[PDB]
Amino acid sequence: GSVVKNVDMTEEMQIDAIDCANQALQKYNVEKDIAAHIKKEFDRKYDPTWHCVVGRNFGSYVTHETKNFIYFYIGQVAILLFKSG
Amino acid sequence: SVVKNVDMTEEMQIDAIDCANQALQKYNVEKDIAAHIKKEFDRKYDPTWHCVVGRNFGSYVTHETKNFIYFYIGQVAILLFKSG
């Protein structure tokens, strides 16, 4: 339960981020694909544009001002999910 | 592997990495490591910064972040951000 989140990431959205991350980790093996599934699901449910990186071997990203985000873990795997640009 | 805001340019990123390396060199406990990075960024780049190191930290709800960097020192995650 170690989480950093924005005030606009309320319980329902946080529960959905955890559920989506669990669904992505259940379905896919490659961390880039896991991240992409979470990003796609949040664009669809909570409107674009979301970005997501999973684990610690991801492509670097320069973001414009984030307006909402959540940083959390599924076991040892970090998930950063944020809305920007 | 870094995610950062456009305002975290190379000099500030270099300082975040150096600060994190200095904190990990000096302190054993991840809460203290994070607090050292936060204190140094408040002093050098003005408050209010917040920092969490590793994956066993106290949760935090932040108001709109205006600058941040997410990066790793080996297997250890560092999230450093300015808000509230």
Helix (H, G, I), strand (E, B) or coil at B84: coil
CB-CB contact of B24 with B73 (8 Å) = yes
* Strands in chain B per DSSP E: 3-5, 49-53, 60-62, 65-73, 76-83
Supply the Cα-derived Rg of chain A in whole angstroms: 12
Cα separations in angstroms, A83 against A39, B15, B82: 9, 26, 16
Who contacts A57 (Cβ-Cβ below 8 Å, separation ≥6)?
A31, B1
Optimal mutation site among A2, A3, A4, A53, interface B, most CBs of chain B within 10 A: A4
Amino acid at A18: I
Specify the DSSP class assigned to residue A29.
S
Closest Cα in chain B to A51: B3
- Could you tell me the resolution of this structure in angstroms? 1.6
Chain A CB within 8 Å of residue B26 CB: no
Smallest Cβ–Cβ distance between B3 and the set A2, A67, A80 belongs to: A80
Residues listed for chain A: 85
Which residue's entry shows tokens 């050098």? B44
Q: Which helix (H) or strand (E) holds B24?
A: helix B10-26
Chain B CB within 8 Å of residue A29 CB: no
CB contact under 8 A, B63 and A1: no
Tokens in use for A55? 């684990």
CB contact under 8 A, B55 and A73: yes
Range of the domain at B75: 1-84
Chain A CB within 8 Å of residue B64 CB: yes
Query: What is the nearest CA distance from B43 to chain A, expressed in angstroms?
Result: 23
For residue A54, what is the domain's CATH number? Answer: 3.30.740.10
Task: Name which of A59, A14, A62 is nearest A38 in CA terms.
Answer: A14
CB-CB contact of B68 with B81 (8 Å) = yes
Chain A CB within 8 Å of residue B9 CB: no
Closest Cα in chain A to B57: A2
Q: How many domains does the structure of chain A reveal?
A: 1
Chain B CB within 8 Å of residue A85 CB: no
Specify the DSSP class assigned to residue A70.
E
DSSP β-bridge partners for residue A41:
none
